[PDB]
Amino acid sequence: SSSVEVSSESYETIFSQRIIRDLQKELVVGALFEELPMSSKILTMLVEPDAGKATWVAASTYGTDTTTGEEVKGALKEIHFSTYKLAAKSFITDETEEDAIFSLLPLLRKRLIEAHAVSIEEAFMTGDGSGKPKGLLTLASEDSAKVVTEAKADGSVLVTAKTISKLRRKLGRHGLKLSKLVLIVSMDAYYDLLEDEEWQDVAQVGNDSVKLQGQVGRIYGLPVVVSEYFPAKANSAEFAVIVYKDNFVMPRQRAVTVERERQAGKQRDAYYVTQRVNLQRYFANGVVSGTY
Amino acid sequence: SSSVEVSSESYETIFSQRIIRDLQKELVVGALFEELPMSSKILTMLVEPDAGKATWVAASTYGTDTTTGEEVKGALKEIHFSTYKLAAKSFITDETEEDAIFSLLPLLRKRLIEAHAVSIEEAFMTGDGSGKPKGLLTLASEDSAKVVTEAKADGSVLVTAKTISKLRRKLGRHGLKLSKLVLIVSMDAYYDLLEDEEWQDVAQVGNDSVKLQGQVGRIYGLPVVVSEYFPAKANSAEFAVIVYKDNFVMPRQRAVTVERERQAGKQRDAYYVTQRVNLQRYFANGVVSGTY
Amino acid sequence: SSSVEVSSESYETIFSQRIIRDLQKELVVGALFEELPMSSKILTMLVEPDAGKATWVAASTYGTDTTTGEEVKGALKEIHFSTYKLAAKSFITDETEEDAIFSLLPLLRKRLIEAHAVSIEEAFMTGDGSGKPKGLLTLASEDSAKVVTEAKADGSVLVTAKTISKLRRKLGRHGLKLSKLVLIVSMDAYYDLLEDEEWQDVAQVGNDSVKLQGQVGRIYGLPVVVSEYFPAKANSAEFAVIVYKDNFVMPRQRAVTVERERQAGKQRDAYYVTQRVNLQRYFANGVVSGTY
Amino acid sequence: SSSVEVSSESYETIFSQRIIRDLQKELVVGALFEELPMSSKILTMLVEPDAGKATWVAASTYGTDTTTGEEVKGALKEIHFSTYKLAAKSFITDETEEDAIFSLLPLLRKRLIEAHAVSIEEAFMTGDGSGKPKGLLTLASEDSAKVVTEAKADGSVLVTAKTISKLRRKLGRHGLKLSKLVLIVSMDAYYDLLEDEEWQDVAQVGNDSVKLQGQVGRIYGLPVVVSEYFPAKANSAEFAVIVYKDNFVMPRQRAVTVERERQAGKQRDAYYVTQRVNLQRYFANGVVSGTY
Amino acid sequence: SSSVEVSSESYETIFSQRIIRDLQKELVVGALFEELPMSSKILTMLVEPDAGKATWVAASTYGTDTTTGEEVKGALKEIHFSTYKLAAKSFITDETEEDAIFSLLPLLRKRLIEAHAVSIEEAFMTGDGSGKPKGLLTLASEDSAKVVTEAKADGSVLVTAKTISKLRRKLGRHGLKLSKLVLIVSMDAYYDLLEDEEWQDVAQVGNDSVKLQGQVGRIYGLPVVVSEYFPAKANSAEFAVIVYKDNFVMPRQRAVTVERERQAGKQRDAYYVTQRVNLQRYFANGVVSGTY
Amino acid sequence: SSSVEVSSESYETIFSQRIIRDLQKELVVGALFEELPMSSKILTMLVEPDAGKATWVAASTYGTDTTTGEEVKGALKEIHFSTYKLAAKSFITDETEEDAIFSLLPLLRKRLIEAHAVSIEEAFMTGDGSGKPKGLLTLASEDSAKVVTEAKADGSVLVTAKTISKLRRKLGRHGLKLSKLVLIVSMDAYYDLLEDEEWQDVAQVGNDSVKLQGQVGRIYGLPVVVSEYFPAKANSAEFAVIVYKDNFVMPRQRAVTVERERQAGKQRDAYYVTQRVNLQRYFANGVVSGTY
C-alpha cells in the first residue's frame, strides 16, 4: 500500500539484540606449555656436563702412568633465554562513541585482549624469532633445524599412519615422550575415517556413540589438537610432536596487562595492550615435525 | 437369466464404509525444527559481538607513543527476519452435496488440512524464499551458499560412506554437530543393506532381527530420515545433514487457523485456511548439503 | 520244484493291508492368510481417504479473496470383491467297487476332499483369476502388476541373497511388512547352507547342531515356507514375499461342503465338492515377488 | 657245545597262553536297524492310503453335469516281504581236536558263530537278494535304486561336504531323517584334521583333546559310523546316509540259533549255526547313497 | 717380564677341580616302555585268537545235510621270545690309578655305567636283531617291515602337519591309539614353529607364556619326545608314532648289575657292566614310521 | 642508541648456569652377568666330566675273558682363569683450574669414573680379548666360534622373528635357556610393530598403554636389552642370545678404585683409575649370536 517516500519509515525495525562473537576458535598450541612469570632482562643457564673420560690401565701398583693414565675434559655450553616484547595499540574517538549508542566501548575492550592473544599464538607457531618468540615449526622444521620425516625407520614406502609412528619413535631416541599431537584439520579428518586391522572402523562399528567418536579422534589415546595455524605447503602435511611436560615453558617477562591514556593529539581515548614473551630452547631435536 | 436391463438392478450391491487416506507418509524435515511464536511483524536483530582487538607492542612505559596504533570498534550485523504467507480457500456448495451423502465435509476439513500440510513441507524442504519459507536444500546447496562436498578432505574419488564423513567434519569446524541425516529413498536403499567391514552384514548377519536393521538405518547411530522430497540432478546425490536442535528455529508469525464464511454469492460454504511462516538463518554454512 | 501250475496258488501268499497317503507334505501358501467366512454375494464398498488439501496464501486480510484459497474434493475409489467358484466332482459305479469289497467309499471321500484341497492351492499360487481365485506369482509379478526386483537399490550384480534384501526393501517402501517368506525348495536347501563370513559356518560350527541349521534356514529369523508349486522359465527364481497377516484375507462365500447324490441314470454314487473363495487386492504393490 | 640235540630240548620252551582273534572290528551296518522278531514265512502288506479326492465343482447344483462328476478310487499297491535263509556249518573230527589240547571246542563254537555273523553282515551290506537278505547299498546306489547325486543343486563342482548335503536334503524330501551316517575310513581320516575357514581347524582348535575329536568325527553332530566294509571302486567314495530308526526293518523268522549234531559217517562232531532274515524295501528311494 | 723358568711358577695358579659327566640328556626313547623282569632264556607260548567260526546254515533241521558241514579249527600261532646280551667292560690298572688322580675310580665307575646306558639306547633305537635287541625304527621303517606312510590316505602333496595326520589314521586302522610322538631335534624345532590357520603361530603368539611353548611342542595335545639318536636318511625324515602304553614291552632276563674282578693273571682292576634284554614284536603294523 | 661497545656488556647480564649430564642412557650388555669378586692371581682347575664307560658283556661266568677289556679314567682337561687390566690416568693442573670456577674438580672426578665405565663396556661388548676382556659379540658370532644361524632346522626362507627362533632352539641343544635377548635399536624399531595373528598389533591395538608397549618390546615376554654399542655390520643384524644366569660369570680380580697423586715434577693434579677383569668361557657353543 504505502511505498518508500509515503510512510514506510515509520514502522518497527528490530535490531540484533545479543550478537555472536567474531572468532569462535580456541586459543591453544602457542600456550600449551607451563606459563612461568618472569621480570628479568635475560636468563642465563649452564649444564655440567662431565669430566674426565677414563680408560683401561693395566694397574699392579698404586698410581700408574706407565701405560695410559691421566684424562680430563671440561666442557660447555652456556645458554641464554632471549626475551621479546609483543604488544598492540588501538584508537577510539569521542566523535565515534557519542551518537546515541554508547554500548560500543564495553564490547570493544574484550575484543582487544582476545585479539592480542591471537597474534601471539600465530607468532609462536609461525615466526622467525625477530621481534617475536622462537618458533615451533621453525625449530622443528627443515628450514633451520633440518628435521624432515624419519628415514632411519623407513625401508622404502610409507603411509600416513606410519609417519606418526616414525616421528613418535624419533622422540624416544631424544629420550622424550609424546603427550599430545598437534595436527592439521585435514589430517585429523583423514584419521577420523581411520583404517585399522580391527576391521570394524572405530568411528562407527555398528552401534555408535560419543565414546567411539572421542576414541577415533584421539591417536594413541592422546588429545589431538585440531588446529589451522599451518600453511599448506603442497600435498605435504606438517605435524608437531614432542612431549608437553618435559619440553618447553613460556617465560613471560610481562604478563598481559591493558594500559590506557586519553592522549593521541586530542582526547580521544588510546588503548595499549602489552605483553613480553618467549619460548625456551635447549635442543634443535627438542621438538620434531616431519614433511609428508 | 438375470441380465442387466432385465432384473439385475433389483438385487443386492454392497457399498463401502470407511476409506483409505491419501498419503500415509510422515510429514517431517520441514517440521523438524522448534516452533517459536512471533507477534512482531519484522525483527531487526542487530548482532553485537566485539570491541577492540589485539596488537603486538614492546611497551614498558605508562604512556607509549612509539609502538603501534590502538583500536576501537563498533559491531555488526543487522539481520531482518521477514515472514511469508501461505494459505488457501475451498469453495463448496450444498448443491453438489445434495444426493444422499452428507458426511463428506467432516473428512474434507481434515483432507484440506492434511494436504495444506504437504505443501508446507515441500516449501520448507525446497524453496528460493520468495513467497515461501526458506528452503532447506537450497539454502545449504550450491545454489545460494556454494556449499557442496568438502574438497579439502579429498584427494579425488569419493565413495558413498566417505562423502558423509567429509560433510560430518565440515559441520564441526562450524561449531555445530549432526543428529539425523535426510536421504533420498533410493540412496537409503544402499544403506538399508550396505556392504560393510565386519564382513557379515550389520543389517542382518545371517539371522536378521529388527535390532540389526534398526542399527544400520541409523548411520553413526543417528536416525536416517527417509524422505522423497528431493529434486533429481542425475546419478548425483543430495543430502540434508545438520543438527536439528541447535540449528534454525521455525518462526511461525501466525499459527494455522481456519476461518469459515458462507458468503460467495449465495450460500455456499466458504473456507479460508491461513498460516504465516519462515525459517531462521544466521549463516548458510550453518546448514550443509553436498554433491556425490 | 514248486512253481506256477503245481499247487503254489493254493498255498500261502500274504496280500495287502493298509495304505500310506499320496503326498506326505502340507499344503501351504494359498492358505497362509486369514480365512474369514462370508455370506454376502458381493463386497462392494466405497473407500474415501481424502478431503480438503490447502495451500500457501499470503493473506493480511480475514477473507482472502485477493488470491484463491479454496480447496476441497471428494475421493475414490469403489471396488468390488467378487467371489469365484472352485469345485471337484466324481461319478463311480457300484460294479467297480464290488467283488467282495465295499469299504472303498469312506476312504474315497477323504482322497476327494484332499485332492480338491490341492487344486485350491494350485489356483491361489498361479491362476489367471477368472472363474477361480487370482494368483500370487501371476498377480504379483510382471504378468499383471509390473513388480519384479528393485533395481534402484542395486549397485550392479544381483546375487541371490542380495535379491531377497532389495525385495525386502521394496516392501517397506510400500509401507507393508514381512512376516513369512516363500521360496523354492531348490533355493531353500542353499539357505539352509548359507555362506556367512562368521567363518566356521553356522550349520556345522565344529560344535555342530540342529539349532544352527534351524536358524540359518530361517532367512531373517522368519520361517521359510518351502514350496514347489512354482512354474519353470529357465532357472529364474521366483519368490513370494509379503506381510501375511496385515494384507489380504481369503474370503469364503461357501465353506467346503460335500453334496452327495446317487441318482445318475443308474446308482452309482455321485459326489460333488464345492467351495467359493477369492483373493483380494488393494494395490499393485500389495504383494511382491521378484524375478532373478 | 650247546646246539639242538645236546640238552636244549629239556630246557625251557614257552608256548602261547591266550591269543588274539582274527577280527577286532565291531560289526556294524547290517545289524543297525530294528530287529523285529518274526515267525511267518512271508508278510504280505497292502497299503491302501487314499480314497476320494473329488473335484472342484461349479455349484448351485448337487450332482454336477457341467463338469466331470464325483470321484472315488480304491488303491494300490500290495507288496510282499519274503524271508531268505542264511545258514553256515562246520564239522570237525576227533582227529582234528586231538594234539594235546582238548579245550578248543568251546572256543571253536564261539568262533563259528562270530564268523557266520560276518557273512550275514557282508550280505546285508551288499547282496543281490537271492538266498541272502537284500543289500543295503545294492538298493541305495546305482545298482537298482538308480539313485545318485542330485544335479538339481549343482552349479558345477561337487566336494565331499556338499555331496553329503545333497544326499541329506534328498531324505527330508522323502519324508525321513538322518540319524547316523555310514562312511569310508579314508574320507573320515580327513575330518581327523578337517580343513576349514576358521583356519585354526574346528577339529582341534587350539588345544586338541579327545572331546573335540569325537564331536568333529561326526557330521551334523550325528555319529559317523566308521567302516571299511564297502567295496573298492576307484577314487569314487560311496556313502550311506539314511535314517536309522525310521527305516527298513529286519524281520527275523529265525533269530540266530546254535545247532549241534555229531552224525556224518562216524561221530565226529558238527556245528551248525542258522538265522533267517531279510531286509525290507518300502521304497527304492527309501535309502540314499550316491556317486562321488 | 717374568715367564716360565724365572719366577712365574712360584705364584699360585689354579688347576682343575670339579667334574661334569658325559651326556646331559635324558635316556629315553628305547627306555620309554615298561621294563618287565623275566628269568626265562626263551619263552614259548601260543597266542590263541579264535577257534571255529560257524558259517551260515539254512536249517529247518537238527542235522543239516542240505548245506556244507560245520566249520571248526584249532588255534595258531606259536611265538618264541629270545633274550639277547648287552654289556660293556673296562680293564684298568694299579699303575694307571697311581700317579696323579687316585679319586678317578669313583667317577670312572659311574661313567662306565652311564655310558653303557646310552649304548643300550643305541641298540634299542636301531637294532640288528642279532646279538642285541630288535630295533625300534628298524621294525617300524622300510628296513625289515616295509612300513612307510599310507599312500591310501594321501590327498596328494604330503606336508609336515599332514604326514602325522595320515600316520594317525594308519594307527586307528590297527585299532591302537596315538599318545606320544618321537621326533628328531631338527624337525621338532620346525614343529615348535607350527603354522596353523590362526596365522600368528601358537608358539609364542604375542602374549607368550610357558604353556604356549609347552603346547606347540605338543602335537595333538600329546608331548613329543625330542631325540638325536636318529639317523639322517636323506631329505627324508623319520617319525616314530605309536601308543606308548599298549605296545611292546621290554623283557629283561637280567637287570643291570656291576660285576668287579681283579684277575687276568695279574691285578689290575676289571669292571664289567652287564644286562640281558629283548624287545617284543607282535606286529609290524604294531609300530608305525614313515618316509617324507 | 645502544649497541655492543657502548655500555651493553656492563648492563645487567644473566651469566651461564646449571647442568645436565652426557650419556643419557644406562650401561647395558657388559653388565648382564654374575659378578664374582676374585682375590686370586689365577685359578688353574680340571674339568671333570666322565671316568670310564665300559661296554657289553655276554657273561656266562662271574668275570669274562671272551669279551673286551674294562675302562676307568681320570679326567680331562685343564682350564685357566686369567685376568686382564683396564685403566687410565688424567692430567690437570692448578693453572687450568684458576679462572673463577672451583666446582670443576668435584664434577670432573665423577665424569672420569663414568668415562672409564664406558671404555669397559665397549671392550666388553666387542674386542679381540687380547689385553682387554673378551667381546660378548665376538666369541658368540662367526668370528671366533663359527656360530651363525641354525641352518639344519631351517628349511626355506626367514624373517627377523625367525632368526631369533633359530637361535632360541640352538641354546637348548646345549641344555641352556634364555633369560635376555640383546638387540640393535634399528631392529627394536621393527619389533615395535610386531606382525602377529591378533592382527591389530599388540603395540597399539586401538587403545595404547605403557603395558602393551612393555609386552610387544619383550620378545617371549623376556627383556630385550636395547643397546647401541653394536657394530654396524651391514644391512645384517646381529643379536646376542644365551642364558645370562646359567652360563658365564664375569670375574673381577680388582674392583674399580681411584688412586690419586699430585706429584710428577710439578704439582699438577694426577688421577689414576684402575681395575682388573676377565670374562669366562667354557665352550664355543655356550654363547650364541647369529647373522641375519
CATH code for the domain of F107: 3.30.2320.10
Asked if residue C197 lies in contact with residue C240, where contact means CB atoms within 8 angstroms, the answer is no
Question: Which amino acid is residue B258, in one-letter code?
Answer: V
Question: Which residues neighbour B239 within 8 Å (Cβ) at sequence distance 6 or greater?
Answer: B163, B164, B167, B181, B182, B183, B288, B289, B290, B292
Same domain, D182 and D161: yes
Nearest CA in chain C to D164: C193
Same domain, E141 and E69: no
Euclidean distance between CA atoms F250 and C147, whole angstroms: 88
Question: Which amino acid is residue B109, in one-letter code?
Answer: R
Q: Name which of B17, B85, B273 is nearest C60 (Cβ-Cβ).
A: B85
Which segments within chain F are labelled E, that is strand?
Answer: 34-37, 43-46, 78-81, 84-92, 181-184, 224-227, 238-241, 249-261, 269-277, 288-291
User: Helix count (H) and strand count (E) of chain F?
Assistant: 6, 10
Asked if residue A252 lies in contact with residue A86, where contact means CB atoms within 8 angstroms, the answer is no
C-alpha distance across the termini of chain C, in Å: 65
Choose from A47, A71, A195 for mutation: most chain F CBs within 10 A.
Answer: A71
Euclidean distance between CA atoms B210 and C178, whole angstroms: 11
Cα of A184 vs its chain's centroid, Å: 13
Please check whether residue F216 lies inside any domain of the structure. Answer: yes
Euclidean distance between CA atoms C20 and C22, whole angstroms: 7
Asked if residue E44 lies in contact with residue E79, where contact means CB atoms within 8 angstroms, the answer is yes
Q: Name which of E45, E81, E197 is nearest D201 (Cβ-Cβ).
A: E197
Nearest CA in chain C to D153: C186
Domain boundary among the residues E82, E104, E133 is at E82
Please check whether residue A292 lies inside any domain of the structure. Answer: no
Same domain, E89 and E51: no
Euclidean distance between CA atoms C128 and E70, whole angstroms: 75
Across the strands, what pairs with C254? C276
Cell 699360585 found at: E12
Decide: helix, strand or coil at residue A92: strand
How far are the Cα atoms of A65, A138, C216, D225, F51 from residue D164, in angstroms, in the given order? Answer: 91, 72, 18, 14, 67
* Residues in chain F after which the chain is broken, C→N over 2.5 Å: none
Instruction: Domain count for chain D, please give it.
Output: 2
How far are the Cα atoms of C85, C118, C248, D103, E203 from residue D72, in angstroms, in the given order? Answer: 21, 16, 34, 71, 75
Question: Which amino acid is residue B84, in one-letter code?
Answer: Y
Chain B hits for A124, Cβ within 8 Å: none
**Count of beta carbons in the 10 Å neighbourhood of residue F175:** 11
Chains near F (3 or more Cβ pairs under 8 Å): A, E
- The resolution in angstroms reads 9.0
Is B52 within 8 Å of A110 when comparing Cβ atoms? Answer: yes
- Nearest of E281, E214, E215, E278 to residue E242 by alpha carbon: E281
How far are the Cα atoms of A23, B150, B166, B242 from residue B177, in angstroms, in the given order? Answer: 18, 16, 13, 7
What is the DSSP code (8-state) at residue B22? Answer: S
Across the strands, what pairs with E37? E252
Report residue C111: phi and psi, to 5°: -60, -40
Please check whether residue F90 lies inside any domain of the structure. Answer: yes
Handedness of CA A231, A234, A239, A240 (dihedral sign): negative
Is E50 within 8 Å of D11 when comparing Cβ atoms? Answer: no
What is the DSSP code (8-state) at residue D160? Answer: H
What is the DSSP code (8-state) at residue F133? Answer: P
How many beta-carbon pairs below 8 A join chains A and F?
A: 193
Euclidean distance between CA atoms A222 and A227, whole angstroms: 15
Written as nine digits, the cell of D118 is 560276518
Asked if residue E108 lies in contact with residue F72, where contact means CB atoms within 8 angstroms, the answer is yes
Is E57 within 8 Å of D270 when comparing Cβ atoms? Answer: no
CB distance from E246 to chain F under 8 Å? Answer: no
Is D20 within 8 Å of E165 when comparing Cβ atoms? Answer: no
Asked if residue F176 lies in contact with residue F243, where contact means CB atoms within 8 angstroms, the answer is yes
Written as nine digits, the cell of B174 is 562450524
Pairing of strands E56-57, D269-277: parallel
Euclidean distance between CA atoms E99 and E108, whole angstroms: 16
Cα of A225 vs its chain's centroid, Å: 10
Euclidean distance between CA atoms D240 and E210, whole angstroms: 46
Residue positions counted in chain D: 292
Percent helix, strand, coil in chain A, to 5, is 20, 20, 60
- Nearest of D132, D258, D120 to residue E71 by alpha carbon: D258
Chain C hits for B255, Cβ within 8 Å: none
Is C52 within 8 Å of B90 when comparing Cβ atoms? Answer: yes
Is A118 within 8 Å of B54 when comparing Cβ atoms? Answer: yes
Please check whether residue C145 lies inside any domain of the structure. Answer: yes
Pairing of strands B180-184, B239-242: antiparallel
Burial level of A86, CB count in 10 A (0-12/13-18/19+)?
A: buried
Same domain, D197 and D87: yes
Handedness of CA E3, E9, E12, E18 (dihedral sign): positive
Is B71 within 8 Å of A88 when comparing Cβ atoms? Answer: yes
Distance between C239 CA and the closest CA of chain D, angstroms: 18
Distance between E212 CA and the closest CA of chain D, angstroms: 10
Written as nine digits, the cell of D215 is 564331536
Asked if residue E160 lies in contact with residue E196, where contact means CB atoms within 8 angstroms, the answer is no
Is D58 within 8 Å of C115 when comparing Cβ atoms? Answer: no
Nearest CA in chain A to B77: A16
Euclidean distance between CA atoms A165 and A160, whole angstroms: 9
Same domain, D63 and D202: no
CB distance from E117 to chain F under 8 Å? Answer: no
Question: Which amino acid is residue B94, in one-letter code?
Answer: D
Written as nine digits, the cell of E162 is 599332514
CB distance from C105 to chain D under 8 Å? Answer: yes
Is B206 within 8 Å of C221 when comparing Cβ atoms? Answer: no
Euclidean distance between CA atoms F290 and F292, whole angstroms: 6
Asked if residue B74 lies in contact with residue A104, where contact means CB atoms within 8 angstroms, the answer is yes
Written as nine digits, the cell of C178 is 514381512
Distance between E98 CA and the closest CA of chain F, angstroms: 10
Question: Which amino acid is residue C144, in one-letter code?
Answer: S
Euclidean distance between CA atoms A121 and A133, whole angstroms: 10
Is E173 within 8 Å of D192 when comparing Cβ atoms? Answer: no
Is C201 within 8 Å of D197 when comparing Cβ atoms? Answer: yes
Written as nine digits, the cell of A69 is 693414565
The strand order across the sheet containing F34-37 reads F34-37, F249-261, F269-277, F84-92
CB distance from E199 to chain F under 8 Å? Answer: yes
Helices (H), chain A: 94-97, 104-125, 160-171, 185-192, 210-216
Euclidean distance between CA atoms A162 and A172, whole angstroms: 16
Same domain, E58 and E99: no
Distance between B158 CA and the closest CA of chain C, angstroms: 15
Burial level of A70, CB count in 10 A (0-12/13-18/19+)?
A: buried
DSSP secondary structure letters along chain E: ---TTTTGGGS-------B--S--S---SSSSS-EEE---SEEEEE---------EE--SSSS--SSPPBP------EEEEE-EEEEEEEEE-HHHHTTS-SSHHHHHHHHHHHHHHHHHHHHHHS-BSSSS-B-SSTTTSTTSS-----GGG--SS--HHHHHHHHHHHHHTTT----EEEEEHHHHHHHHT---TTSS-TTTTTS--HHHHHHHTEETTEEEEEE--S---SS----EEE-SSSS--EEESEEEEEEEE--SSS--EEEEEEEEE----S-SSSSEE---
Euclidean distance between CA atoms C278 and C82, whole angstroms: 7
Asked if residue B122 lies in contact with residue B229, where contact means CB atoms within 8 angstroms, the answer is yes
Choose from F43, F45, F55 for mutation: most chain E CBs within 10 A.
Answer: F55
How far are the Cα atoms of E185, E218, E234 from residue E190, in angstroms, in the given order? Answer: 9, 12, 17
Euclidean distance between CA atoms D237 and D290, whole angstroms: 8
Euclidean distance between CA atoms E272 and F54, whole angstroms: 7
Distance between A151 CA and the closest CA of chain B, angstroms: 25
**Count of beta carbons in the 10 Å neighbourhood of residue D290:** 23
Helix axes A185-192, B160-174, angle to 10 degrees: 140
**Count of beta carbons in the 10 Å neighbourhood of residue A167:** 23
CB distance from A243 to chain F under 8 Å? Answer: no
How far are the Cα atoms of C107, E88, E133 from residue E272, in angstroms, in the given order? Answer: 100, 6, 19
How far are the Cα atoms of B123, B255, B257 from residue B131, in angstroms, in the given order? Answer: 9, 17, 19
CB distance from C246 to chain B under 8 Å? Answer: no
Written as nine digits, the cell of C91 is 461319478
Is E89 within 8 Å of F169 when comparing Cβ atoms? Answer: no
**What CATH number is given to the structural domain containing C134?**
3.30.2400.10
Question: Which amino acid is residue C19, in one-letter code?
Answer: I
Method used to determine the 3D structure = cryo-EM
Same domain, D63 and D134: no
Chain D hits for C269, Cβ within 8 Å: 70, 72
Written as nine digits, the cell of A3 is 511505498
- Nearest of A58, A47, A53 to residue F109 by alpha carbon: A53
CB distance from E246 to chain D under 8 Å? Answer: no
Euclidean distance between CA atoms C71 and F27, whole angstroms: 93
Please check whether residue B97 lies inside any domain of the structure. Answer: yes
Asked if residue F200 lies in contact with residue A197, where contact means CB atoms within 8 angstroms, the answer is yes
Report residue E107: phi and psi, to 5°: -80, -45
Euclidean distance between CA atoms A54 and F110, whole angstroms: 10
CB distance from C208 to chain B under 8 Å? Answer: no
Cell 594307527 found at: E171
* Residues in chain A after which the chain is broken, C→N over 2.5 Å: none
The helix or strand, by DSSP H or E, that contains position D255, with its residue range, turns out to be strand D254-261
Is B86 within 8 Å of C62 when comparing Cβ atoms? Answer: no
Written as nine digits, the cell of B144 is 545460494
Q: Name which of A40, A52, A74 is nearest F115 (Cβ-Cβ).
A: A52
Written as nine digits, the cell of E77 is 600261532
Asked whether at least 3 C-beta pairs link E and B within 8 Å, the reply is no
Pairing of strands F181-184, F224-227: parallel
- Chain A residues 25-84 with CB within 8 Å of chain B: none
Nearest CA in chain F to E261: F63
Question: Which residues neighbour F130 within 8 Å (Cβ) at sequence distance 6 or greater?
Answer: none
Same domain, E65 and E180: no
Chains near E (3 or more Cβ pairs under 8 Å): D, F
Please check whether residue E225 lies inside any domain of the structure. Answer: yes
Cell 556449499 found at: B147
Pairing of strands A79-81, B35-37: unpaired
- Nearest of F67, D11, C152, D181 to residue B237 by alpha carbon: C152
Where residue A201 falls (left for φ over 0; alpha for ψ -120 to 50; beta otherwise) is left
How far are the Cα atoms of C20, C103, D51 from residue C107, in angstroms, in the given order? Answer: 12, 8, 4
- Nearest of D4, F190, C155 to residue B187 by alpha carbon: C155
Decide: helix, strand or coil at residue F238: strand
b/e per residue D171-200 (b: at least 16 CB within 10 A): bebbebebbbbbbbbbbbbbbbbbebebeb
Nearest CA in chain B to C52: B112
Euclidean distance between CA atoms B234 and E207, whole angstroms: 54
Report residue A48: phi and psi, to 5°: -60, -45
Decide: helix, strand or coil at residue B104: helix
Chain D hits for C207, Cβ within 8 Å: 202, 215
Range of the domain at F187: 83-291
Helix axes A160-171, A185-192, angle to 10 degrees: 110
Residue positions counted in chain B: 292
What is the DSSP code (8-state) at residue F222? Answer: S
- Nearest of F47, F46, F66, F45 to residue F56 by alpha carbon: F66
Please check whether residue B12 lies inside any domain of the structure. Answer: no
Same domain, D159 and D127: yes
Written as nine digits, the cell of E126 is 636301531
Chain E hits for D186, Cβ within 8 Å: 152-153, 169
How far are the Cα atoms of A18, A96, A106 from residue A101, in angstroms, in the given order? Answer: 15, 9, 11
Asked if residue D272 lies in contact with residue D85, where contact means CB atoms within 8 angstroms, the answer is no
The helix or strand, by DSSP H or E, that contains position F216, with its residue range, turns out to be helix F210-216
Euclidean distance between CA atoms A144 and A122, whole angstroms: 19
CB distance from D159 to chain C under 8 Å? Answer: no
CB distance from E193 to chain F under 8 Å? Answer: yes
Chain C hits for D73, Cβ within 8 Å: 104, 108, 111
Residue positions counted in chain C: 292
Euclidean distance between CA atoms C16 and D48, whole angstroms: 8
Euclidean distance between CA atoms D69 and D62, whole angstroms: 10
Please check whether residue A76 lies inside any domain of the structure. Answer: no
b/e per residue A229-256 (b: at least 16 CB within 10 A): bbeeeeeebbbbbbbbeebbebbbbbeb
Decide: helix, strand or coil at residue D113: helix
Chain A hits for F273, Cβ within 8 Å: 54-55, 57
Euclidean distance between CA atoms A17 and A30, whole angstroms: 34
Nearest CA in chain E to D15: E45
SS (H, E, C) chain C: CCCCCCCCCCCCCCCCCCCCCCCCCCCCCCCCCEEEECCCCEEEEECCCCCCCCCCCCCCCCCCCCCCCCCCCCCCCEEEEECEEEEEEEEECHHHHCCCCCCHHHHHHHHHHHHHHHHHHHHHHCCCCCCCCCCCCCCCCCCCCCCCCCHHHCCCCCCHHHHHHHHHHHHHHHCCCCCEEEEEHHHHCCCCCCCCCCCCCCCCCCCCCHHHHHHHCCHHHCCEEEECCCCCCCCCCECEEECCCCCCEEEEEEEEEEEEECCCCCCCEEEEEEEEECCCCCCCCCCECCEC
